[PDB]
Amino acid sequence: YEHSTVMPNVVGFPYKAHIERPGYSPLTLQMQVVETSLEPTLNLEYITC
Amino acid sequence: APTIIDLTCTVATCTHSSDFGGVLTLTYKTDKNGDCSVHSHSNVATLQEATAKVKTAGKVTLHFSTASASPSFVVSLCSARATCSASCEPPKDHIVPY
């Protein structure tokens, strides 16, 4: 059963999603962002000392 | 035969798919516990079972399969009657092997 949602990028925020299938009882998921990391791409130019 | 009075019909869920995708619940009032022959009087919906156990509790369930967007059929339980109408949503599976 395909589903789609949008959840905030806030660490520790307890996002809960409601999935309501027509033939079955509704379901609630819980997703949480424990940790995030933003990695740039680097090209070394030179070294100084 | 058990005496059935004040028979009402409601549909829990419906989905017009090839398998039996309908749940039908009947409320009734009885004096004794026995066996009733259940039939549906239209070919828009097809029941799964022929007989049901009627008890003093006052609730039996039936499974039916339909292919119309909104069915409406008259179901009988021994001698009683009722009119069930429901709203069914289409199924998601494109292809089935049965």
Added chain:
Amino acid sequence: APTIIDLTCTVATCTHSSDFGGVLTLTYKTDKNGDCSVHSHSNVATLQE
């Protein structure tokens, strides 16, 4: 704290004397049994307890 609903107040006997010369009766409906705090919101009458 216990939940109190439908409070009705009746006075059996009264006598405006120096000592505590009144008797007060309260009827209610509760869910559990415990301790409540009793207070009178006007200074015309002072509760003993």
Added chain:
Amino acid sequence: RTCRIHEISCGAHSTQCIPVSWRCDGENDCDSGEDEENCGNITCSPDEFTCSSGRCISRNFVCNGQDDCSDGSDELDCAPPTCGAHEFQCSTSSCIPISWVCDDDADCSDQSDESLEQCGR
């Protein structure tokens, strides 16, 4: 109520009469499941609980506070009721605050709270 000539009673304490055809039919038609007891020899039936030992007990012996399964399987996954962690149980099964035990007032309808055995007086 004597059941009709084609009906059997669901035990000595049940007012429920089932058809003679509903005794050992594989469904629990009796409130106690006694209709499914003593059918296929010991063969467990819909009115009986299967102990982890393989023994069949009546479903009425599941969660009765006694080890009828001899392995305690009937007492596993039940739900025992009592008073809260701050309440005292009177011998009449009423719950009072633990603060009202041995306070010289009879808050239990049977004076269990003020009982000489409980108050250690």
